[PDB]
Amino acid sequence: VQLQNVTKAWGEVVVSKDINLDIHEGEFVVFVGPSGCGKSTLLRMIAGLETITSGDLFIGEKRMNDTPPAERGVGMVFQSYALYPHLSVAENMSFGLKLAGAKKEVINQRVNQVAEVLQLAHLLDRKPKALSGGQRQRVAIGRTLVAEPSVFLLDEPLSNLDAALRVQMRIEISRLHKRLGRTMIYVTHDQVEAMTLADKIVVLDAGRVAQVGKPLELYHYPADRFVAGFIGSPKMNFLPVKVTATAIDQVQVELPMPNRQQVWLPVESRDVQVGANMSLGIRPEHLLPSDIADVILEGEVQVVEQLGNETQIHIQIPSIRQNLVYRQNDVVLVEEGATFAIGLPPERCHLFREDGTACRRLHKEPG
Amino acid sequence: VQLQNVTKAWGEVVVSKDINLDIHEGEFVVFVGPSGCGKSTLLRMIAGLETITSGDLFIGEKRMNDTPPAERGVGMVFQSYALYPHLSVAENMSFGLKLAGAKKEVINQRVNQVAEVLQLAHLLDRKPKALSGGQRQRVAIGRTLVAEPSVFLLDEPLSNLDAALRVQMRIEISRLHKRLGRTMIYVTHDQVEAMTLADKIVVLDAGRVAQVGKPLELYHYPADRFVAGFIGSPKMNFLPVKVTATAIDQVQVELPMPNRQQVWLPVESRDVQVGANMSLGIRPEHLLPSDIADVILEGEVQVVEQLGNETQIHIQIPSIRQNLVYRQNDVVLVEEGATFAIGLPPERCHLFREDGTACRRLHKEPG
Numbered sequence: 001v002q003l004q005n006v007t008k009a010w011g012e013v014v015v016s017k018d019i020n021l022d023i024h025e026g027e028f029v030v031f032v033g034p035s036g037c038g039k040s041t042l043l044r045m046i047a048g049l050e051t052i053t054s055g056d057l058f059i060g061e062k063r064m065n066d067t068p069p070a071e072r073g074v075g076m077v078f079q080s081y082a083l084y085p086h087l088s089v090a091e092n093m094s095f096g097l098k099l100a101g102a103k104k105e106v107i108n109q110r111v112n113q114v115a116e117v118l119q120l121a122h123l124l125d126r127k128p129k130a131l132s133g134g135q136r137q138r139v140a141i142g143r144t145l146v147a148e149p150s151v152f153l154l155d156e157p158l159s160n161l162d163a164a165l166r167v168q169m170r171i172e173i174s175r176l177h178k179r180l181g182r183t184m185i186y187v188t189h190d191q192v193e194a195m196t197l198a199d200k201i202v203v204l205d206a207g208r209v210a211q212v213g214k215p216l217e218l219y220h221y222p223a224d225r226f227v228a229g230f231i232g233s234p235k236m237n238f239l240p241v242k243v244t245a246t247a248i249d250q251v252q253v254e255l256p257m258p259n260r261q262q263v264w265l266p267v268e269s270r271d272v273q274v275g276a277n278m279s280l281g282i283r284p285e286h287l288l289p290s291d292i293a294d295v296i297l298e299g300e301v302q303v304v305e306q307l308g309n310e311t312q313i314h315i316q317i318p319s320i321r322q323n324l325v326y327r328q329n330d331v332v333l334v335e336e337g338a339t340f341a342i343g344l345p346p347e348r349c350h351l352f353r354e355d356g357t358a359c360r361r362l363h364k365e366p367g
Numbered sequence: 368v369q370l371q372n373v374t375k376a377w378g379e380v381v382v383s384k385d386i387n388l389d390i391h392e393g394e395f396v397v398f399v400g401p402s403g404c405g406k407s408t409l410l411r412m413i414a415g416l417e418t419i420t421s422g423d424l425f426i427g428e429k430r431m432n433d434t435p436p437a438e439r440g441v442g443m444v445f446q447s448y449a450l451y452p453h454l455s456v457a458e459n460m461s462f463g464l465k466l467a468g469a470k471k472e473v474i475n476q477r478v479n480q481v482a483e484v485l486q487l488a489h490l491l492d493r494k495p496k497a498l499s500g501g502q503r504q505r506v507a508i509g510r511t512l513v514a515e516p517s518v519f520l521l522d523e524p525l526s527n528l529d530a531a532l533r534v535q536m537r538i539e540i541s542r543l544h545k546r547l548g549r550t551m552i553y554v555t556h557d558q559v560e561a562m563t564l565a566d567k568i569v570v571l572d573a574g575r576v577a578q579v580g581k582p583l584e585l586y587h588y589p590a591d592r593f594v595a596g597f598i599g600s601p602k603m604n605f606l607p608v609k610v611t612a613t614a615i616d617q618v619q620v621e622l623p624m625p626n627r628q629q630v631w632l633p634v635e636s637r638d639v640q641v642g643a644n645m646s647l648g649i650r651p652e653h654l655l656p657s658d659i660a661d662v663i664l665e666g667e668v669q670v671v672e673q674l675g676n677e678t679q680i681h682i683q684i685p686s687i688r689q690n691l692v693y694r695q696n697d698v699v700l701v702e703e704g705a706t707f708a709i710g711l712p713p714e715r716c717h718l719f720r721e722d723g724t725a726c727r728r729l730h731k732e733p734g
């Protein structure tokens with residue numbers, strides 16, 4: 001429930017810096033970050049299986065860096081095959097006889113209720129070698145939902161599950177949290193999941209903590225370029241611009257286009273010098289039909305991905321490196337090489353200084 | 368490259384009731400289906416890691432049910448991985464080009480260009496033990512990539528990766544499929560990935576092949592309730608309706624609503640009988656705003672998930688036992704209890720018979 005300058009490292013390969021997390025009791029916290037940033041290591045250190053090179057681990061109240069993996073209040077172990085190849089499903093799931101707590105021995109009343117939510121009922125007498133990746137995965141989860149620790153440490157527990165099934169499990173896991181009221185430390189790559197379950201999201205990046213905030217705060221108010229480009233599916237579009245003017249709460253920038261159009265952005269303005277080279281971000285879903293008016297960008301359709309509910313059009317614009325990704329509702333029929341124009345809304349624009357830190361958007365978004 | 372009446376069972380449990388597929392050479396085919404429907408198995412039968420109870424498998428153009436795995440022309444990459452802990456990352460990815468007689472001149476070269484795209488260049492001298500899920504998984508892909516088989520069998524090869532990196536790999540794997548142009552049998556649960564990469568999609572259901580088609584073919588025209596309920600993120604909503612009338616290319620149904628509203632659907636009508644109890648399907652993203660539509664449904668907001676780019680609102684309607692899910696663009700503030708309304712667009716409504724088979728939709732959709 002609490003870290004303090006927890007630094008981990010092995011040689012000159014520092015996996016984690018002085019991260020300072022403050023997880024309250026019964027809070028649902030998910031960890032997200034680029035592959036390699038230190039999410040799994042962090043979760044393990046919070047438990048056993050991994051040492052703590054420096055810092056304090058306040059679980060409950062007093063430190064627990066030396067406490068044996070046994071009693072901590074933790075309940076980890078996850079993802080397809082971590083199960084005993086000789087025991088059965090019911091046997092593996094009902095291993096909650098000694099996992100940091102005090103339970104009876106007629107708990108069959110729960111191992112049967114858990115295998116129910118995980119739709120594993122008809123597989124209780126099954127052996128691991130007889131379960132699919134997805135099935136094994138849920139068994140591994142039951143083992144933890146059965147023990148019912150004081151603090152769960154889930155690590156991508158819902159992987160290997162079809163979409164429909166994965167939605168039901170999100171519901172189940174959400175209930176198991178608004179009931180046991182325990183503390184949860186979830187780790188995932190599924191961003192939709194993060195936003196739906198998380199009651200506070202932690203974004204890691206190369207060992208360091210990038211930002212911590214609620215779902216919509218991270219989405220709407222990334223503190224820097226990195227976080228901005230990490231939260232949100234089709235990465236946020238980034239255009240190179242130049243600050244031409246400065247007000248108290250404006251900051252005018254010049255788009256690299258041939259026409260060199262300028263526009264006033266509802267941004268911080270603090271520490272923004274005229275003439276500075278800055279990064280302007282705009283999300284694929286925030287771009288406009290262009291049918292309306294104002295700031296417009298035109299280019300050639302490079303890619304077009306059909307998703308049934310929406311269409312993502314990749315547009316190439318002169319003077320801009322990478323294509324500009326744009327998402328539009330429904331099936332939209334356009335071809336490659338075609339000419340496409342979109343509208344760039346100033347309220348929904350982000351601006352990052354050369355150092356990458358953000359210029360606190362002033363526009364108030366609901367939430 | 369071809370299956371006929373292929374059957375597979377473990378004792379008394381069948382897992383592939385005679386499936387018939389016809390994967391053309393060079394095609395990118397993705398397999399989707401409920402957890403434990405038989406995706407990995409079917410994949411391990413094309414490789415040889417599993418025995419074919421009945422039927423004939425014709426990889427290339429010759430029956431291979433009894434051919435040894437190592438000599439089928441198949442290069443597979445599953446979840447179990449293949450990172451030999453005694454070999455360095457660079458040592459792996461090359462191990463594949465073992466007997467291929469590849470020489471340090473040809474190999475080591477493509478091992479470098481591959482460690483580049485997969486972004487492991489800074490990890491060659493590493494060892495599986497000192498890596499992370501996502502990293503190890505790219506390494507595994509690296510092996511099969513470097514070996515450039517004649518047939519790729521990818522089993523959820525991009526899981527364990529952040530959304531950004533994953534999108535990048537989808538572009539790489541896609542480019543790799545264009546460059547070489549060899550057959551690829553991809554298994555995944557990520558429906559956006561399927562829709563994105565696939566040329567054809569196979570939907571499996573409890574060992575059987577439910578439907579085969581191009582992505583938009585399955586999204587707009589599911590052959591049955593099962594596929595309808597399977598393809599598409601927030602699951603299609605289903606409403607019990609009664610057939611009140613039937614015309615040429617029509618069919619009129621009565622909604623569960625207390626006002627027993629009857630609405631005509633541009634649907635097949637073939638094998639539709641007045642009085643039958645059918646299922647009406649409508650996707651959360653196809654429901655319309657209340658004011659801009661006829662045939663409205665009002666109810667109590669139960670859940671509201673804020674995804675950032677959109678808002679999903681579950682509505683309990685006095686009639687349907689299941690909550691009706693609705694997707695609305697952008698951030699939408701609604702109180703968990705509010706009265707909400709939505710439109711039921713007839714042209715985008717699917718109709719399923721009592722036996723679950725769909726009544727061919729006559730509305731032409733773009734695609």
Ligand SMILES: Nc1ncnc2c1ncn2[C@@H]1O[C@H](COP(=O)(O)OP(=O)(O)OP(=O)(O)O)[C@@H](O)[C@H]1O
Pocket residue numbers: 010013015033034035036037038039040041042496497498499500501502527528529
């Ligand atoms: N035994 C080890 N020795 C040295 N460095 C290690 C070791 N195990 C992990 N690491 C380092 O820590 C980082 C990895 O792992 P972690 O397992 O913390 O990643 P994640 O952040 O959980 O990423 P992923 O999404 O890929 O699972 C790696 O990039 C690697 O450099």
Ligand SMILES: Nc1ncnc2c1ncn2[C@@H]1O[C@H](COP(=O)(O)OP(=O)(O)OP(=O)(O)O)[C@@H](O)[C@H]1O
Pocket residue numbers: 129130131132133134135160161162377380382401402403404405406407408409
């Ligand atoms: N050794 C076995 N004995 C009996 N049944 C088995 C065995 N191995 C797998 N199965 C059955 O085959 C089905 C599973 O596996 P497959 O491995 O074919 O699943 P998938 O379709 O890849 O699903 P998942 O997404 O969950 O990985 C399971 O539902 C299981 O009942």
